[PDB]
Structure formats: C-alpha cells, structure tokens
C-alpha cells in the first residue's frame, strides 16, 4: 500500500531540502545580517514546506524521468533527480520577495517541529 518506495522518497527529500538549504545559506551570507534568528529559522521552514506543497507535481516530473530510464529504477536515480530539483529551483524569488515585503512568516511551533525533524522524516502527500 505504498505510492513510492520509502527509500526513494527519502533520497528525494534529503536531496531536495539539501539543495534548497544550500541556496538559502548563499542568500543569507548576503542578506542574513538584517534578519533575526527566528526569521532565518522561518526561511528554513519555508524550504521544507515548499517541498511539502509541491511534492505532487515534483512526482509528475520524477515519474516522467524515471519512466524515460527504460529500466527498474534504483535509489541512485532518485538521489540524482532530487538533487536536480534542489539545484534548478531558484528559491531566491521567495527569499527576496518575503524579505522586501516584510512578509517572512511569524515563527510558530509547527514550523519549529518541521525544522527539528530530519529531512528524511518530513511528511509528504503524494496526491
């Protein structure tokens, strides 16, 4: 009763969040002086929540690539595709927008909860 093997999901999520986070570190080296601690934590949450929100369309794209492989997939295929998602998305549209508009979300306990979990454990919905 699984939509996707758990190992494939974990590979994807780890690589996606890692890529988003690398982008956020790069952005914070420039703009991080202006932000409070809780705002920075809120942007880390924004990375994980963005993966949550868009997981289903990510799965459309992933399923296309996997199908184009023409063979049974292995975990390495999902590691690679998750890294591709993590690199290609430019989260700075959101970081810049939220900073400039003073719209960084107020940091709440559910955000802290998501931030404390390992990326591998961030829950996602396939449908």
């Amino acid at each position: 009763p699984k939509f996707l093997n758990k190992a494939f999901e974990v590979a994807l999520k780890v690589q996606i969040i890692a890529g988003f986070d690398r982008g956020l570190v790069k952005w914070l080296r420039v703009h991080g002086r202006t932000l409070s601690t809780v705002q920075k934590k809120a942007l880390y949450f924004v990375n994980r929540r963005y993966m949550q929100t868009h997981w289903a369309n990510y799965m459309l794209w992933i399923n296309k690539k996997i199908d184009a492989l023409g063979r049974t997939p292995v975990v390495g295929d999902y590691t690679r595709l998750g890294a591709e998602i993590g690199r290609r998305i430019d989260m700075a549209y959101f970081y810049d927008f939220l900073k400039d508009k003073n719209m960084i979300p107020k940091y709440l306990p559910y955000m802290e909860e998501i931030n404390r979990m390992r990326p591998a454990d961030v829950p996602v919905k396939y449908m």
């Binding site: 929540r49 929100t53 868009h54 289903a56 998602i85 998305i89 927008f97 559910y110 919905k125």
Partner: protein, 110 residues
C-alpha cells in the same frame, strides 16, 4: 472556514507572481486536493495546514512550473492586459473552493 490567500503580481514579466496562502483550520478539516489550471497544464498542489507558497510565470527542465493564461485585453484600458489562472480546492467536507488568480501587466507599448 477557508484559506486566507493573496497573489502578489509583479509589474514585470521577468518576475513570476507570488501566491501565498495560509490554512488555519481544525485538524479534522483538510484540503484533499488542490489543482491550479495553468496554460501549460493542471498543476497539483498540496495545501498543508499553515503556510504555503507558489510561483506563477508570465511566460515559459524544472518540475511544476505554472504559466498564466493570457494576455487578455480588458475593456476601455489600452495600457494593461490580463493574465489569469484558476484553482480548485476540494475539501474533506463541503463544496469545493474555486479561486481566480489574476494579474494585470502594463501593456507594451501603450
């Protein structure tokens, strides 16, 4: 109960619009499905409890890109055009919520 959302339109085709939505609801109410009707296809979204965000492109590698329909002419105004998508939220109870997400783009040239 519903979602509290807004769209933040750029005045420039190079900056995608920002869709930002928050769901404050009892945990027993969920958005079972959400779909955004874009000119390049129907893009599925999971509207989690709390904060959610999405980009909408004016023009068209990466998964999930949503491009506005348009441009559309608007009456009596020759200096702007309309870009739009619609979305449907299907809830765990009650009628669905249909959103109109619209952005006006200054017209080149006027």
């Amino acid at each position: 109960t519903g979602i509290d959302w807004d769209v933040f339109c750029s005045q420039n085709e190079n900056i995608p619009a920002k869709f930002i939505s928050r769901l404050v609801a009892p945990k027993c109410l969920a958005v079972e499905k959400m779909d955004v009707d874009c000119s390049n296809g129907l893009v599925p979204i999971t509207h989690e409890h709390g904060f959610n965000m999405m980009l909408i492109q004016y023009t068209r590698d990466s998964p999930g890109m949503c491009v506005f329909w348009g441009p559309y002419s608007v009456p009596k105004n020759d200096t702007v055009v309309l870009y739009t998508v619609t979305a449907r939220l299907k809830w765990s109870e009650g009628p669905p919520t249909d959103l109109s997400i619209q952005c006006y783009m200054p017209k080149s040239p006027d």
